[PDB]
Amino acid sequence: LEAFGESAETRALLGRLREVHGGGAEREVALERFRVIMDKYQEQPHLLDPHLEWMMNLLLDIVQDQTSPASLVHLAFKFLYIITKVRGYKTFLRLFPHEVADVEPVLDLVTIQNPKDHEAWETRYMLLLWLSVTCLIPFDFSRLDGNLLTQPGQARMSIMDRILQIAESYLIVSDKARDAAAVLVSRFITRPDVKQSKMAEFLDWSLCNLARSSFQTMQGVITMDGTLQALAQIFKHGKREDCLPYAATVLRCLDGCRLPESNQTLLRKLGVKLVQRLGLTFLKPKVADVPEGVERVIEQLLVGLKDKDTVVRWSAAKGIGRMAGRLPRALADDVVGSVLDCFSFQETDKAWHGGCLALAELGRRGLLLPSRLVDVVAVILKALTYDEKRGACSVGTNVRDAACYVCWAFARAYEPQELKPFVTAISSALVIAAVFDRDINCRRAASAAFQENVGRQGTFPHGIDILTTADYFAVGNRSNCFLVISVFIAGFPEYTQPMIDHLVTMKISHWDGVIRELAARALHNLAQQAPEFSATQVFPRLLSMTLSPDLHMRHGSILACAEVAYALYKLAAQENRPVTDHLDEQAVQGLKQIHQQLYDRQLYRGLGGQLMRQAVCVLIEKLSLSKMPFRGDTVIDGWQWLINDTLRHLHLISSHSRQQMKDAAVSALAALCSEYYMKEPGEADPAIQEELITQYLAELRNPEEMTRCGFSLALGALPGFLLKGRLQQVLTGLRAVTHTSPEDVSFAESRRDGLKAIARICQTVGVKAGAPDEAVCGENVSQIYCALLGCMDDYTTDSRGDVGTWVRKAAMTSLMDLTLLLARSQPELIEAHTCERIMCCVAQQASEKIDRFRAHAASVFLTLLHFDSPPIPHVPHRGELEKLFPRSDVASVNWSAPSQAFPRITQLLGLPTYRYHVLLGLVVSLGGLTESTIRHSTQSLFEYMKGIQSDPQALGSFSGTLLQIFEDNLLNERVSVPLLKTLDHVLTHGCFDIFTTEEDHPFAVKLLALCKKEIKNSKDIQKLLSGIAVFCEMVQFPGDVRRQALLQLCLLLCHRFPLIRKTTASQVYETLLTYSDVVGADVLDEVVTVLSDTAWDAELAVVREQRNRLCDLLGVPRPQLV
């Protein structure tokens, strides 16, 4: 925002006040419009400075007119107040009028205010501040009154007297006017005449208010806060020789008031404020004989730093800083020593915030002496690292903020030579914090302090270089500070060992898991800039931390060890040398005892068992990916075991960390099998290959589900050299699970994982034409495609919902991974029928009603269609599909959004091979329950039907396909109601208006019979309603079908459920009102009356007669009891 680009709108809104002050709806609209326009500049209202005056004068020529009604004046004052909250009063009041002709017009307006009118509080607020901006006039209030003895019988009261009676009344109110009363007295008693006239009276009133008021009675607390604020403002904006005489009685009364013990945060803050206001009245202002009251003031202000709230701690720190700046240089040392006591071992973390704030306030003025450098600094080094856990919450944010504030105030508290001794401990602190700090406020707080230090002083090692990179915006993302900027800072030798030490000490022992993972990932990269230091000093450290009793510390140390080992292996892989060159025998000896020291302490149980398993699996993966020298050693046999047990106890892991555990275990198994299970180049161990495979295969039949789910992915992660002659068995074992058996009905995750495992195995072994038990060949490629397609019709619906859909997802990602592979090896294997079936299935799963599975299906379809290297052979209407989905438009498509998917999927009906499946899939969305999906699908279907409604051939083929879909899903509860609703919608829209010309069309003649057979003996209410609607829509077709529909509608009118009886008549009324040719005008006034008068929800025996009577009118044979 560079300028106010809403001047005309605001001007019009302000001008409309004179013709919107008599409205209640328009008034609120204009207010809400003025508020939202002014709130845009709440973060930078200075841009509105050039406009302030004109808008202010506009609002003033409405409240400064004599023909202005109270209501119109109240809206102007509300607007005026809206401009004083955004710009603030201290800056917006300087433009208000201040002429001597504005003293009585403003006091007289202040004397017509209703104190009991809560709706007009903005008016009173704007009144008091205006009256206060008018007390600056450089004249005596006496010159203005003139002659008071002009009214005989009753003398007029003086202006000054009226103002004293206005301030005392507004200083005991409960609205916001009391705050405006605090700003008025500050500019009323601080002038010469008022000082000599009413100062004593106001002081007696205040001392009486704070001598009778309490912090328990509500109005008493209201009287306490206002009096304290008034006293503080008077002592702040008051002369020191007119005030010092009263400083002795004010403190004596405040001491007896007992504020520290009172249970009010505002009262204590105001009390500390008033105590620091009186404290400076005794000393002389300095520009860089100690009365006894100063000691009492200091004793009160040094007890306001241990408060339980920060609002009082900040005030106490400000008071201490303002007092130290006025006292001599001798008492300053004692004050600093007394303030330093807040950082004692027995003091809580709350006392540390106040101490650091006081230290910063003292350093800002330059009062700390050099002798206080070895101590104060020694404390700051700790305050920057304050981060403790007090039960379930964490504390240390405000401590670090105050530490950064103190650091930022040391660039002007000492000379460059005075602070030259601690530029190696403070530069390392600032940098370390700005780099690893958790909170973003502290990080940027440490960034600004370092900038100020390098700007003012400029003695820190590489100040400009560290400031250019680690700037205010660069430290915004925490991830960028740990993995990028950290390495850049460590590039220099002055910020390498300290940062690594701070990371290994505190960050590794942190309570947050994400922070530990980030610290480990940062150490991974930092080890590159210091391999020797990380291999000789950090590795022993982390190794000793893996034997700690702390769980989080053990996990962090294990992660750090794994990351350092991986980094050392990567670094050594460049020079083509073994990883043992970095780690010593003792180091590789301790990496073979981590797991045996955990399993022997039973550290794999409880809530920490999952974390320990994750850490050990990550360590095993990082060690196997480095080709460590543990081949032949029994330690390997241990690692493998720890994996199996995990896959055997996955159900024990929480539901919020089982997928990650399974993935990590599978990755560790994959890294281990392709490293420690190889006998020769290209071969594998016969004993292990046999035992592991037999165990895994026999495990697939365990009735437990999570075990099968884990072992599936385990099989799907084995290398290729271990399946050179065992594929014919692994594939059969995986396919045996993909089948749905009577016992494994609700077992969907097992098959979902088996499909993914088959995908991975097929991808690893590849294609070799001739070798069935070694690779995917033309002998074991058909079975695979048949097993993958048999899991695409998984519509299992249970109490958990449509869980089968999950399996379908695994069928879309698996079938793809196979196809793309064949095209990249032996495209001939991709048969035409199989490819057509896969495409039709993908089309159906992309025309579904769920939004996340439908979106996944469209992406898979586009990926399979946009494959050109080489082009997948046997693609029905390939060119048609390519023209319908150009590559340029696919870059921006919201497939998840039905609006941006249904109109693009409905066009597939034009293709014969897709027309059937696509419609079977779209029926579920056209007859589902989602309203938006129903609307979008119906609109997209009508947009396509409009193009083939006047075509007897296209419309006929569409109706035939719809009826074939209906027949194929006869008596199917998942396709009966949705398809019936779709037919009802299509009939209501009038798409089949051509078949209604002749009589007895082959379409309706069988559609009616199918609907009858579907609704024959049905108790579902939704199904009954759908059938009734279909039979009430099918009446448009003349011939025997019309008479049969009327007989069915009469049969349904007398159903067991009165609700159905009423709904049938309600729908028949609409059907008769729609089609007029169905019934002649000679018996039309006889049907509507019988339907409106007869109560179809009453006795069924009585309604049978009325219903039978409607059979003698419609001309429908009257049924009987069979």
Binding site: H118, K176, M218, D309, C393, G801, D851, E931, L1059
Partner: protein, 431 residues
């Protein structure tokens, strides 16, 4: 004596809280002075749940006002019932957030969180048995929703054994003209799905439609939306503020209405619907009230419960009726062979009875449903998220503060997973 600490963040949240407090003050019988002039023993039977016991029998609310600018904090302090609130319960800053979640959640929010938690602890320490926490805020603003999520996370970290309630308000284009309201709506939903137990969805599009059509208002303002929200809130907490045969516990109610820890979103409704000023129309019977309360028209959310599945339903009546009538009505509604069968009420509703109706009405009813149709709302904003995130519109306001595109992708994935789970469970067998 179970005490619940009330909280209200943001302008909309503070206004809704003030309106609800002023509405319940007239029902409990506590004049704005801070004393009780009520003439019913049932009023003071559970007044401690939302009011403290001070000297002279003066009742003090348990609300905690919080903001980043002072304008709204000043309007409530001078409101009709601005004296009952403690002066030291008002926590505020000066600059605000600027309709930016990153500025109201990570910077100013985390800067004033200390002063806010100070008062939160000061209030919690003055309670015999703390039950949970309640928060009223919106989802289309920066300060409001940001500070709300931050305070919820802080209260969960410092008090994991406490229930959390959030009467979040969903924005709407017909009420606001801000372009970055979808981003803040997506982030708050992601935070709430992780750190919340109850979430009463109050759409700002359904309320506008009701005020425009039902109330027949030419130009409805926030005063026609806040009154309805406060009425619905008072109807929801009818059992928590007055006696009742039904279990009026918050933890048990949440456990019964939270069978799924990700689908904890509740659509609230209430009949009869009234405007401001005119409220004494007629006294609807129990059948009419039950038919109107379960109607999509009397729903505070833009979604229709009929277009989904009923997971849990809680009904609460108040007026002059016996539990036998409500039981007979609810049992005959589900009777497929009766003359009063419908198709939008499940076979299990937690009915309640009360003898203290609201002001200007002799009878009233409130309904709370955990239906899956709420997912539709979650898909209304999601679409907008696709028309901005893909173009990186206004992304420099978020990335410049500290946020990463990794946070946006995670929130989008969480919303998509929630919608998918809702749509999947919507197709479960009704056994």
């Amino acid at each position: 004596m179970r005490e619940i600490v009330h909280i209200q963040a943001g302008q909309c949240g503070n206004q809704i809280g003030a309106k609800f407090w002023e509405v319940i003050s007239d029902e409990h019988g506590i004049d704005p002075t801070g004393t009780y002039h009520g003439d019913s023993d049932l009023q003071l039977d559970r007044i401690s749940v939302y009011y403290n016991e001070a000297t002279g029998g003066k009742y003090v609310p348990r609300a905690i006002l919080v903001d980043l600018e002072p304008g709204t904090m000043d309007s409530v302090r001078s409101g009709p019932f601005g004296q009952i609130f403690r002066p030291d319960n008002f926590v505020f800053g000066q600059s605000g957030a600027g309709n930016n979640w990153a500025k109201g959640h990570y910077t100013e929010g985390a800067e004033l969180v200390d002063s806010v938690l100070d008062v939160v602890r000061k209030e919690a320490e003055s309670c015999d048995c703390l039950q949970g926490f309640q928060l009223t805020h919106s989802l289309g603003g920066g300060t409001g929703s940001g500070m709300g999520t931050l305070l919820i996370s802080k209260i969960r970290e410092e008090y994991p054994d406490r229930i959390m309630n959030t009467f979040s308000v969903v924005p709407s284009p017909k009420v606001s003209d801000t372009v970055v309201e979808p981003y803040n709506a997506t982030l708050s939903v992601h935070q709430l799905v992780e750190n919340t137990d109850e979430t009463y969805c109050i759409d700002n599009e359904a309320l506008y439609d009701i005020c425009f059509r039902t109330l027949k208002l030419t130009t409805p303002t926030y005063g026609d939306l806040n009154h309805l929200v406060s009425a619905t809130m008072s109807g929801v907490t009818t059992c928590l503020r007055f006696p009742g045969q039904l279990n009026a516990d918050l933890r048990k109610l949440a456990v019964n209405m939270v069978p799924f820890p990700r689908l904890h979103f509740f659509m609230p409704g209430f009949a009869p619907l009234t405007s401001r000023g005119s409220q004494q129309y007629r006294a609807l019977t129990v059948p009419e009230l039950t038919q109107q309360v379960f109607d999509a028209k009397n729903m505070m959310a833009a979604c229709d419960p009929r277009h989904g599945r009923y997971l849990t339903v809680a009904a609460v009546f108040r007026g002059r009726m016996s539990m036998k009538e409500v039981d007979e009505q609810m049992l005959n509604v589900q009777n497929k062979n009766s003359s009063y069968f419908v198709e939008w009420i499940p076979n299990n509703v937690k009915t309640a009875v009360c003898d203290i109706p609201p002001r200007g009405l002799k009878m009233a009813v409130t309904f709370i449903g955990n239906s899956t149709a709420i997912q539709e709302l979650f898909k209304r904003i999601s679409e907008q998220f696709t028309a901005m995130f893909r173009r990186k519109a206004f992304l420099h306001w978020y990335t410049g503060e500290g946020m990463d595109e990794m946070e946006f992708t995670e929130a989008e994935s969480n919303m998509n997973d929630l919608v998918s789970e809702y749509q999947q469970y919507q197709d479960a067998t009704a056994e």
